[PDB]
Amino acid sequence: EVEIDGVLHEYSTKEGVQEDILEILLNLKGLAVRVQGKDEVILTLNKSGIGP
DNA sequence: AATCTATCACCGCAAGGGATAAATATCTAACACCGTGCGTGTTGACTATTTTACCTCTGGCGGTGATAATGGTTGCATGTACTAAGGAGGTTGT
């Protein structure tokens, strides 16, 4: 599951992104990992300024 | 290209299963003996191994019959689709 600073619905937009917003739905269902422990964990993802 | 933390797990290291090999006991087989009978030997009489001789098989092949017999057989090449060539001959032209 995921919670994002603009995707309150998929038909939305973010002037400064290049996906606008909808082509972010590409690597979430796509990122995978391993985990030591119990069956619920959390990350955040927090890019600031120009880049990937 | 070295570092490790933090995976999914192999090792960390207790248990226990099968194995095989020892000892025993059974099996069979290898042999040495014996007895049988056959293929151990020379000799001898047989009869039919081979040869040649003779008397007389089998099959080599050469030879050709006569009351007369004197107009014959032969069946389906192909039925389509083409069209290129040669053949015909009268004539209206070259």
Swiss-Prot record:
Superkingdom field: Bacteria
Post-translational modification: (Microbial infection) ADP-ribosylated on both alpha subunits by the phage T4 protein ModA. ADP-ribosylated on only one of the alpha subunits by the phage T4 protein Alt.
Function summary: DNA-dependent RNA polymerase (RNAP) catalyzes the transcription of DNA into RNA using the four ribonucleoside triphosphates as substrates. This subunit plays an important role in subunit assembly since its dimerization is the first step in the sequential assembly of subunits to form the holoenzyme. Part of the processive rRNA transcription and antitermination complex (rrnTAC). The complex forms an RNA-chaperone ring around the RNA exit tunnel of RNAP. It supports rapid transcription and antitermination of rRNA operons, cotranscriptional rRNA folding, and annealing of distal rRNA regions to allow correct ribosome biogenesis.
UniProt record similarity statement: Belongs to the RNA polymerase alpha chain family.
Domain comment quoted from the record: The N-terminal domain is essential for RNAP assembly and basal transcription, whereas the C-terminal domain is involved in interaction with transcriptional regulators (such as CRP) and with upstream promoter elements.
Subunit structure as annotated in this protein's UniProt entry: Homodimer. The RNAP catalytic core consists of 2 alpha, 1 beta, 1 beta' and 1 omega subunit. When a sigma factor is associated with the core the holoenzyme is formed, which can initiate transcription. Both the N- and C-terminus interact with different regions of transcriptional regulator CRP. The rRNA transcription and antitermination complex (rrnTAC) consists of RNAP, NusA, NusB, NusE (rpsJ), NusG, SubB, ribosomal protein S4, DNA and precursor rRNA; S4 is more flexible than other subunits.
Name of this chain's protein: DNA-directed RNA polymerase subunit alpha
Lineage: Bacteria, Pseudomonadati, Pseudomonadota, Gammaproteobacteria, Enterobacterales
Name of the gene: rpoA
